[PDB]
Design an enzyme around this catalytic site. Structure first.
Site, PDB file in Angstrom:
ATOM      1  N   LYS A 246       0.914  -1.082  -0.067  1.00  0.00           N
ATOM      2  CA  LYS A 246       0.150  -0.108   0.005  1.00  0.00           C
ATOM      3  C   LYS A 246       0.919   1.062   0.193  1.00  0.00           C
ATOM      4  O   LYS A 246       0.688   2.208  -0.697  1.00  0.00           O
ATOM      5  CB  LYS A 246      -0.958  -0.193   1.054  1.00  0.00           C
ATOM      6  CG  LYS A 246      -1.894  -1.209   1.274  1.00  0.00           C
ATOM      7  CD  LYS A 246      -2.687  -1.148   2.537  1.00  0.00           C
ATOM      8  CE  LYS A 246      -1.741  -1.360   3.733  1.00  0.00           C
ATOM      9  NZ  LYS A 246      -1.298  -2.456   3.664  1.00  0.00           N
TER      10      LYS A 246
ATOM     11  N   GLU B  46       1.595   4.535  11.928  1.00  0.00           N
ATOM     12  CA  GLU B  46       2.515   3.603  11.010  1.00  0.00           C
ATOM     13  C   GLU B  46       3.941   3.994  11.376  1.00  0.00           C
ATOM     14  O   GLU B  46       4.210   4.481  12.890  1.00  0.00           O
ATOM     15  CB  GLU B  46       2.369   4.297   9.576  1.00  0.00           C
ATOM     16  CG  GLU B  46       1.054   3.780   8.662  1.00  0.00           C
ATOM     17  CD  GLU B  46       1.009   2.217   8.907  1.00  0.00           C
ATOM     18  OE1 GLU B  46       2.221   1.530   8.688  1.00  0.00           O
ATOM     19  OE2 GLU B  46       0.100   1.687   9.123  1.00  0.00           O
ATOM     20  N   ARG B  47       4.929   3.564  10.620  1.00  0.00           N
ATOM     21  CA  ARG B  47       6.172   3.230  11.021  1.00  0.00           C
ATOM     22  C   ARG B  47       6.685   4.543  11.031  1.00  0.00           C
ATOM     23  O   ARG B  47       6.685   5.205  10.317  1.00  0.00           O
ATOM     24  CB  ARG B  47       7.061   2.573  10.088  1.00  0.00           C
ATOM     25  CG  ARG B  47       6.415   0.855  10.158  1.00  0.00           C
ATOM     26  CD  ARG B  47       7.273   0.106   9.230  1.00  0.00           C
ATOM     27  NE  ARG B  47       6.806  -1.215   9.248  1.00  0.00           N
ATOM     28  CZ  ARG B  47       5.747  -1.488   8.408  1.00  0.00           C
ATOM     29  NH1 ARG B  47       5.181  -0.853   7.583  1.00  0.00           N
ATOM     30  NH2 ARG B  47       5.477  -3.075   8.513  1.00  0.00           N
TER      31      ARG B  47
HETATM   32  N1  LIG Z   1       6.587  -2.026  -7.954  1.00  0.00           N
HETATM   33  C1  LIG Z   1       7.271  -2.828  -6.764  1.00  0.00           C
HETATM   34  N2  LIG Z   1       8.275  -3.658  -7.284  1.00  0.00           N
HETATM   35  C2  LIG Z   1       8.883  -4.321  -6.449  1.00  0.00           C
HETATM   36  N3  LIG Z   1       8.679  -4.455  -5.068  1.00  0.00           N
HETATM   37  C3  LIG Z   1       7.368  -3.651  -4.892  1.00  0.00           C
HETATM   38  C4  LIG Z   1       6.736  -3.101  -5.528  1.00  0.00           C
HETATM   39  N4  LIG Z   1       5.453  -2.328  -4.772  1.00  0.00           N
HETATM   40  C5  LIG Z   1       5.737  -3.071  -3.489  1.00  0.00           C
HETATM   41  N5  LIG Z   1       6.591  -3.921  -3.503  1.00  0.00           N
HETATM   42  C6  LIG Z   1       7.112  -4.647  -2.366  1.00  0.00           C
HETATM   43  O1  LIG Z   1       6.106  -4.449  -1.418  1.00  0.00           O
HETATM   44  C7  LIG Z   1       6.818  -4.550  -0.003  1.00  0.00           C
HETATM   45  C8  LIG Z   1       6.096  -3.619   0.825  1.00  0.00           C
HETATM   46  O2  LIG Z   1       5.561  -2.494   0.520  1.00  0.00           O
HETATM   47  P1  LIG Z   1       4.850  -1.512   1.476  1.00  0.00           P
HETATM   48  O3  LIG Z   1       5.809  -1.070   2.649  1.00  0.00           O
HETATM   49  O4  LIG Z   1       4.285  -0.235   0.556  1.00  0.00           O
HETATM   50  O5  LIG Z   1       3.731  -2.317   2.038  1.00  0.00           O
HETATM   51  P2  LIG Z   1       2.352  -1.992   2.861  1.00  0.00           P
HETATM   52  O6  LIG Z   1       1.316  -2.706   2.349  1.00  0.00           O
HETATM   53  O7  LIG Z   1       2.340  -0.622   3.068  1.00  0.00           O
HETATM   54  O8  LIG Z   1       2.492  -2.718   4.258  1.00  0.00           O
HETATM   55  P3  LIG Z   1       2.554  -2.367   5.712  1.00  0.00           P
HETATM   56  O9  LIG Z   1       1.216  -3.059   6.022  1.00  0.00           O
HETATM   57  O10 LIG Z   1       3.380  -3.308   6.536  1.00  0.00           O
HETATM   58  O11 LIG Z   1       2.500  -0.905   5.981  1.00  0.00           O
HETATM   59  C9  LIG Z   1       8.263  -4.175  -0.380  1.00  0.00           C
HETATM   60  O12 LIG Z   1       9.048  -5.200   0.371  1.00  0.00           O
HETATM   61  C10 LIG Z   1       8.324  -4.175  -2.006  1.00  0.00           C
HETATM   62  O13 LIG Z   1       9.502  -5.487  -2.040  1.00  0.00           O
HETATM   63 MG   LIG Z   2       2.463   0.484   4.966  1.00  0.00          MG
END
Ligand SMILES: Nc1ncnc2c1ncn2[C@@H]1O[C@H](COP(=O)(O)OP(=O)(O)OP(=O)(O)O)[C@@H](O)[C@H]1O
Ligand SMILES: [Mg+2]
Lengths: 115, 173, 458, 85
Positions: free
Chosen positions: C154, C180-181
């Site tokens: 996300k 968040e972090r």
């Molecule tokens: N376009 C992309 N290419 C490669 N990896 C991607 C891409 N988009 C996202 N990722 C992968 O998504 C992983 C986690 O992404 P992100 O930190 O945005 O997650 P999140 O959904 O916000 O999670 P959280 O719930 O922990 O906050 C990263 O480790 C990355 O490897």
């Molecule tokens: Mg996140």
């Protein structure tokens, strides 16, 4: 001398009220005269006001409110050692076989800390 | 609030006092019992989880103006259920039931200025027919109403204040 | 004047004289050791008792402490003075710089704009992301919601949306981090400062380390700043790092407030608490707010009440799937669940609509065939079904795209794709022009010409 | 007639030696499953370490109107109602 009195009997759960300066600790053993047999109760919770809540180690039927309760100050103690070999016992360490009394040398509390 | 739990004790006490024709003494005893409850050290004692009988016998010790045969019985009955804090409300409900039994009603009158005796008499006479009870008026005139008068009995309210007319008129907006 | 009488976690009860009981949502103040603690009134109990939520760590509070009654709700600085600075939930500055040169302070609890003031807009906002603007395009001043589990990406998608959208938007922007972090907040702030764009962004940060009160009330401060920027007549951009934490903080504090649990143990007021916050984020005839919100999905259960309630408040919804992410396809947008209000032939035009619906139907047919494929294998399929599968796999590969912010992960350089190129490429794929290419040709390519170039070297 | 009966009440409570517990001290009211309910401790604070009989501690989690809820940082079976803390 018995010091407590039964105040509630709801199934196996028996509540006993003691004088405020003599409330038994948790896991201690009580006993009462359930007609013509001694019934052992294990303390589970100390409620406010000297009332203690116990689980009956036997049939709860026939208990009246106000029965005297003897507060054995140690937890449930069972015989141990070589004498127990070849003998059948219940949770209380009483012999279930008809083979007479166990020649116990010691009795140990069942609730003890880990090494 | 102790309003709901105080009711049975107040009713029982009032019926007993009626059967023994000693209502006034009971009211005084109830007031005294309500005062000791407010004592700071007694409040902590009552908050603690003492056994009912020891707390009762300690409460009787602080009261020497109670009719023991009946007042001690009352206190011990309330103690056995931990209702001792309800005494200030038992007193109020006892007073209310006494006023209902004597068919007497207190009425509060609020106006912009002190009323004449004849106006007070007409007010009392009207209220006595409205309630079909005897009335006792008290006057608590107020700085904020600039005219008119407010009559409150029980919770029924009759408003003739000009402040009430001003607000009720703006409501037509 | 007040006295503390109970302390239960984050909830503190205060007794006041009956003639001076504070109103609901009034801010209180109490000295807690060597620091000043703010309390917000939630409920008026009987007898002058009032129930409050502490805006800080409640440990060390004794009973009987004297509480000072402030006569106004929590008020935060607003205006251009907040631009380029990091601010606490209470509106205090958190960066080491000096005090905020505030000129006006606003109460954070405000009413939603009236039904008359609302304004409609259909100006499509273009993004560099093929799948988003193809399947779920969104208009300027609308709401966008990113739904996903833990780790599906996300935050990366939101950062890419920030990078792309900020290109053609010259107005102010507000970023509100909710639960968040902290590390991500520091990285974002530093990368904003390095690019010298910080002076256009107001940042309100209450992160997960904060006690529940800060996470609960932090979003309203960001909303108040965005509303201040909007009422001035500007076009603002609002980004909420995680809207889910707000309801989670409400759930955490709900039990102590004496409210019976509902459903899955959420607070009974879940829907009202979400609606009152969401309704204030709206474009108006005086000014427009564009909003992007990430929505955490607990345990990947899209049927949980918290995700379920959020779905109705959003205009465009992008659903991220863990299963797709495990394939390594990024962004892991699920095209059969993503949907937008703007996918309408009147606004987007006929060609975009037809391409989107064709892609959707092809993928639905592939999903229908997959259960047979799992058991009997692909060989049992009819010759048209095999062609459907082959085209669906190519479509799934083509939806992938290298992001500029993801270069630290993939290494490969990011791509920006126009709407014209994505619609032309997908229409070409569905027409079968590229049936001779392998699947890998489409993986992580910006445009179809790059796909054919990758095919030459396989 | 109210002030005199109030001071008579104070005189009587003085006579019969009913007196409040000292601050920073309290008594255990109930014990169950390692959770302890303590009366008194008017100066306890949230998260404080409460010293028990023996050489063990309890952590104050709730400051109720009439009692403190605490959890024992060790074996709890030996504790009993009415112990000073
Ligand atoms: N376009 C992309 N290419 C490669 N990896 C991607 C891409 N988009 C996202 N990722 C992968 O998504 C992983 C986690 O992404 P992100 O930190 O945005 O997650 P999140 O959904 O916000 O999670 P959280 O719930 O922990 O906050 C990263 O480790 C990355 O490897
Ligand atoms: Mg996140």
């Amino acid at each position: 001398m018995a010091t407590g009195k039964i105040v509630q009997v709801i199934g196996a759960v028996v509540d006993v009220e003691f004088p405020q300066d003599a409330v038994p600790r948790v896991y201690d053993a009580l006993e009462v005269q359930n007609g013509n047999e001694r019934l052992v109760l294990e303390v589970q919770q100390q409620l406010g006001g000297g009332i203690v809540r116990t689980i009956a180690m036997g049939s709860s039927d026939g208990l009246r409110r106000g029965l005297d309760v003897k507060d054995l100050e140690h937890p449930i103690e069972v015989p141990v050692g070589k004498a127990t070999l070849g003998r059948i016992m219940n949770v209380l360490g009483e012999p279930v076989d008809m083979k007479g009394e166990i020649g116990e040398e010691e009795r140990w509390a069942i609730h003890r800390a880990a090494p | 609030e102790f309003i709901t739990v105080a009711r049975p004790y107040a009713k029982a006490a009032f019926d007993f006092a009626v059967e023994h024709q000693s209502v006034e003494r009971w009211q005084d005893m109830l007031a005294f019992a309500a005062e000791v409850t407010k004592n700071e050290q007694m409040a902590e004692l009552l908050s603690g989880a003492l056994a009912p009988e020891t707390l009762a016998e300690s409460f009787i010790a602080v009261a020497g103006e109670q009719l023991d045969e009946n007042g001690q019985n009352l206190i011990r009955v309330m103690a056995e259920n931990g209702r001792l804090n309800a005494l200030p409300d038992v007193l109020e409900q006892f007073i209310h039931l006494r006023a209902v039994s004597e068919a007497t009603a207190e009425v509060d009158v609020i106006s912009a200025a002190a009323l004449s005796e004849q106006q007070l008499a007409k007010i009392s006479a009207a209220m006595e027919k409205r309630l079909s009870r005897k009335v006792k008026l008290n006057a608590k005139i107020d700085k904020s109403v600039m005219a008119g008068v407010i009559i409150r009995a029980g919770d029924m309210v009759i408003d003739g204040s000009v402040r009430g007319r001003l607000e009720r008129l703006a409501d037509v907006l | 004047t007040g006295k503390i009488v109970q302390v239960i976690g984050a909830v503190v009860d205060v007794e006041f004289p009956q003639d001076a009981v504070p109103r609901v949502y009034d801010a209180l103040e109490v000295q807690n050791g060597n620091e000043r603690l703010v309390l917000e009134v939630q409920q008026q109990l009987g007898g002058g008792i009032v129930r409050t939520i502490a805006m800080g760590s409640s440990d060390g509070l004794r009973r009987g402490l004297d509480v000072k009654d402030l006569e106004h709700p929590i008020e935060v600085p607003v205006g251009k003075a907040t631009l380029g600075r990091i601010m606490n939930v209470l509106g205090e500055p958190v960066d080491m710089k000096g005090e905020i040169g505030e000129e006006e302070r606003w109460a954070i609890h405000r009413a939603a704009p009236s039904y008359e003031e609302l304004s409609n807009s259909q100006e499509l906002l273009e993004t560099g992301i093929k799948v988003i603007d193809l399947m779920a395009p969104f208009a300027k001043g609308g709401k966008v919601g990113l739904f996903g589990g833990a780790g599906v990406g996300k935050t990366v998608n939101m950062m890419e949306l920030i990078r792309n959208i900020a290109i053609e938007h010259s107005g102010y922007s507000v970023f509100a981090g909710v639960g968040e972090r902290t590390r991500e907040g520091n990285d974002f702030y530093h990368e904003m400062t390095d690019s010298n764009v910080i002076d256009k962004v107001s940042l309100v940060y209450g992160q997960m380390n904060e006690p529940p009160g800060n996470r609960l009330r932090v979003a309203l401060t960001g909303l108040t700043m965005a509303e201040k920027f909007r009422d001035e007549g500007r076009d603002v951009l609002l980004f909420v790092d995680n809207i889910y934490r707000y309801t989670l903080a409400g759930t955490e504090v709900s039990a102590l407030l004496g409210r019976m649990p509902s459903a899955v143990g959420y607070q009974p007021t879940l829907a009202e608490e979400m609606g009152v916050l969401q309704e204030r984020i709206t474009s108006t005839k005086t000014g427009s707010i564009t909003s992007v919100q990430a929505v955490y999905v607990p345990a990947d259960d899209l049927t949980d009440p918290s995700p379920a309630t959020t779905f109705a408040h959003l205009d465009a919804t992008v659903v991220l799937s863990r299963q797709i992410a495990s394939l390594g396809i990024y962004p892991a947008v699920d095209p059969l669940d993503s949907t937008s209000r703007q996918l309408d032939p009147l606004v987007v035009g006929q060609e975009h609509y037809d391409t989107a619906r064709g892609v959707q139907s092809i993928l639905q047919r592939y999903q229908e065939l997959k259960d047979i494929i799992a058991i009997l294998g692909m060989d049992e399929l009819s010759e048209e079904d095999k062609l459907v599968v082959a085209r669906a796999r190519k479509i799934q590969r083509f939806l992938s795209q290298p992001f500029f912010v993801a270069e630290v992960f993939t290494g490969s350089p990011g791509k920006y794709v126009s709407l014209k190129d994505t619609i032309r490429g997908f229409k070409g794929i569905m027409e079968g022009e590229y049936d001779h290419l392998p699947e890998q040709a489409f993986y992580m390519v910006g445009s179809i010409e790059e796909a054919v170039e990758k095919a030459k070297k396989l | 007639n109210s002030t005199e009966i109030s001071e008579l009440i104070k005189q009587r409570i003085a006579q019969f030696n009913v007196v409040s517990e000292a601050h920073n001290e309290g008594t255990i009211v109930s014990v169950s499953d390692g959770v302890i309910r303590i009366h008194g401790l008017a100066d306890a604070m949230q998260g404080e370490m409460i010293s028990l009989p023996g050489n063990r501690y309890a952590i104050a989690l709730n400051l109720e109107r009439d009692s403190v809820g605490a959890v024992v940082m060790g074996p709890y079976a030996d504790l009993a109602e009415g112990m000073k803390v």
